[PDB]
């Protein structure tokens, strides 16, 4: 019973006849998926898991860095006294599922408790050879094309009373978000206003389960780099930055129409992988369209002593994409075999 560092390998069903860059990377760097994957239930162990100290995330992070570093073609790169210009053709970009697999002598433990809060003992444990397929969606504020909670919404935090620790919300029902750059940089995303608010009611109640009978407010981002103040994501190689203010402007107490978010495709970005900026070429022409599933949220709670109203306010944060991967790797740990 121990978290030991093995070098994982990846597996995928990448298609050689696809131009999408994830396929090329996983084709060269991964092997095909097990056609008949075997899962083994264990002796009713209470093994401790700690999604916040899970070495898989660093390894997965490196993979996406490698993928991004050999697939994406920024026109200019600014990194510590260096600025590198290269050809920057448009790519075909649509994430594919990647499985992480333990090498010989190791295994992956899987937590199957439906209400696992992210840290602590798991009572329904199983062993697997590889993870489920995880789409490596790089985004902020909203997690797209991820995994759903199977029964109820789950709130996960390394320590929820420490306001400096990020909070990961995992939904149990997808909310579809439709973003289009209509057939050059003005674009928009639609989300059901009613479905988002009905979702907010349950999120607020779940958050309220620790902060008992307090009024819960969702409010817009307080500041930071463009990467974290807007909902950012990659759709077809273009970097969308959507004003999410209209999503996080409501209050919920012990008690259809679309929201269209104004977005812009930016050529100049601050890099998530490393401190620096990158410049990409202007958007393609033609209709740009991506439909994603909102599956979770990243929230930060304002700290400090209480002024008047019982109100706790949460604003989206994020930026360190290790937490994006964590939102998917929380149920796994790598172990050496007896």
């Amino acid at each position, epitope marked *: 019973w121990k978290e030991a560092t093995a070098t994982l390998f990846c597996a995928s069903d990448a298609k050689a006849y696809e131009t999408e860059v994830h396929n090329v990377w996983a084709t060269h760097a991964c092997v095909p998926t097990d056609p008949n994957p075997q899962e083994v239930v264990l002796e009713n162990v209470t093994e401790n898991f700690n999604m916040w100290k899970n070495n898989m995330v660093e390894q997965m992070h490196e993979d996406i860095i490698s993928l991004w570093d050999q697939s994406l073609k920024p026109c200019v790169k600014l990194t510590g006294g260096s600025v590198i210009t290269q050809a920057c053709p448009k790519i075909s970009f649509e994430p594919i599922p990647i499985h992480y697999c333990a090498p010989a002598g190791f295994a992956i433990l899987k937590c199957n408790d439906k209400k696992f809060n992210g840290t602590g003992p798991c009572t329904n444990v199983s062993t697997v050879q590889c993870t489920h397929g995880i789409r490596p969606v790089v985004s902020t504020q909203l997690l797209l094309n991820g995994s759903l909670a199977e029964e109820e919404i789950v709130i996960r935090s390394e320590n929820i009373t420490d*306001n*400096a620790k990020i909070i990961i919300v995992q939904l149990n029902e997808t909310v579809e978000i439709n973003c289009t750059r209509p057939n050059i940089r003005q674009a928009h995303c639609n989300i059901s206003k009613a479905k988002w608010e009905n979702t907010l009611k349950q999120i607020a109640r779940k958050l309220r389960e620790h902060f008992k009978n307090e009024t819960i407010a969702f409010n817009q981002s*307080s*500041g*930071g780099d463009p990467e974290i103040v807007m909902h950012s994501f990659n759709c077809g190689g273009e970097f969308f930055y959507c004003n999410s203010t209209q999503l996080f402007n409501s209050t919920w107490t012990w008690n259809n129409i679309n929201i269209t978010l104004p977005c812009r495709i930016k050529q100049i970005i601050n890099m998530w992988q490393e401190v620096g900026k990158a410049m990409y070429a202007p958007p393609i022409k033609g209709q740009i369209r991506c439909s994603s599933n909102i599956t979770g949220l990243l929230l*930060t709670r304002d700290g*400090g002593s*209480s*002024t008047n109203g019982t109100t706790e306010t949460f604003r989206p944060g994020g930026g360190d994409m290790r937490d994006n991967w964590r939102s998917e790797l929380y149920k796994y740990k790598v172990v050496k075999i007896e």
Partner: antibody
Amino acid sequence: QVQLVQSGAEMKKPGASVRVSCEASGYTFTDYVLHWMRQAPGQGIEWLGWIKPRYGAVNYAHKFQGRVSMTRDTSIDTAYLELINLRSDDTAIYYCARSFDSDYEWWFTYWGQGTLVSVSS
Amino acid sequence: EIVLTQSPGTLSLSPGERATLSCRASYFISRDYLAWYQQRPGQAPKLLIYGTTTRASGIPDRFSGSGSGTDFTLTISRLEPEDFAVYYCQQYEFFGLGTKVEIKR
């Protein structure tokens, strides 16, 4: 050796704005949360908020929303606090500080030397 | 919200005596994190004890920490002259209002 070196004392009139600096050395700047605190004459220590310098995420105390702006320059590893709408009861010694530990980021081993801010007409 | 009540407001003891400083929380705040700091006139505060009981580097042996997870105690086994200063307890963004340790004459 971690060291935080702040700018010198400032005099300001009510309603003005003040900028305080905090120079970091001896460590990877983006690896630790930076907090801002102040100590008014004869009063306790007040936490204004923190900034995580990697992306500039911030958290501002309830009582200072609309009054504070926190930023940083990662190319010279320096953080900056801007305060607007100064009034008399903003007079205080200001400190930036960080924890030695990365799991619990509130064990304040390293403090700036302090900046006196005097606000008067 | 954590409310930390420190006592006494002023502590009057003779040098060489043992000081017991109190910090009372308004609800259960665990034993894992509460920390104590020292501040001398004209200086920033200095971290003395972290994680209820662990002395940092350079902290004298006469400082010892204890606590139930709600109420905590800082013991100075034998006060030396330079230990007379202001002492705060803290966890996260929350601070006590301080205890001054002074010389009885």
